[PDB]
Design a protein around this ligand. Structure first.
Ligand code: HEC
Ligand code: HEC
Lengths: 107, 108
């Protein structure tokens, strides 16, 4: 399960693996992927001004640290049909660190 | 609600004293007052066949996990208004953590 880690390590992971497609700040733009401000406690597929797959929408995930960790392990396994082109983060430590960063960066 | 892994030993005792009267956990275990909970952490609410749910539980369509289960068990009728699960709730985070640690193992 998710355990608080290092947002410092997390930020580097996010920057090298996610930032290309996602911004995190309030009012930051949608790009290849949606802006993630407020993602934790929001349902999947709900950010306005972004065109999602029906798959992402229908999943009805209420994003939290634990289901995010499962998603990021292997996105297409968690949401078959998703257009997020990301293989996954296999190490629990990396997901813990990334998610620690993301919670703080998107709140 | 935050979840932290706890004691399944303590969780099992919580399950026996607070849940077992209405629920089974094992694969193929019977529906009773409440539905069998095998596989609950891989599906949405209201989806076990052979059990008659409220519309409220079905409509909620919650994708159960540790965090939202913890929120639900704090106060079920608040989380799913109109649910017929007659359970007041587990007010202490430690108890929820322990129970959910047990449930993850017992229902897998
Ligand atoms: C493009 C090459 C991306 C990279 C790299 C990552 N993500 Fe992504 N993500 C992308 C798209 C196109 C989408 C929408 C998918 C769909 O099927 O519609 C997403 C979606 C997410 C989500 C869910 C957002 C929501 O429901 O509002 C999350 C939480 C997310 N992505 C996170 C994320 C992280 C943390 C990344 C690096 C580890 C990452 N993504 C990479 C496109 C791309
Ligand atoms: C009867 C007196 C119950 C007790 C005690 C507990 N539960 Fe229950 N639960 C009960 C019913 C009748 C229902 C169906 C509710 C409806 O509105 O249709 C439920 C439902 C659940 C669920 C959702 C299951 C699903 O969506 O498939 C869960 C996860 C659940 N119950 C768990 C649970 C736990 C952990 C309990 C003790 C702490 C517990 N319940 C007590 C009836 C009763």
């Amino acid at each position: 399960e998710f355990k608080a880690g290092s947002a410092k390590k997390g930020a580097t992971l996010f920057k090298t693996r996610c930032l290309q497609c996602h911004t995190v700040e309030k009012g930051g733009p949608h790009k290849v992927g949606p802006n993630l401000h407020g993602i934790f406690g929001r349902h999947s597929g709900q950010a306005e001004g972004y065109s999602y797959t029906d798959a992402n929408i229908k999943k009805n995930v209420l994003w939290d640290e634990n289901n995010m960790s499962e998603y990021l392990t292997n996105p297409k396994k968690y949401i078959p049909g998703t257009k997020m082109a990301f293989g996954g983060l296999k190490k629990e430590k990396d997901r813990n660190d990334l998610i620690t960063y993301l919670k703080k960066a998107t709140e």
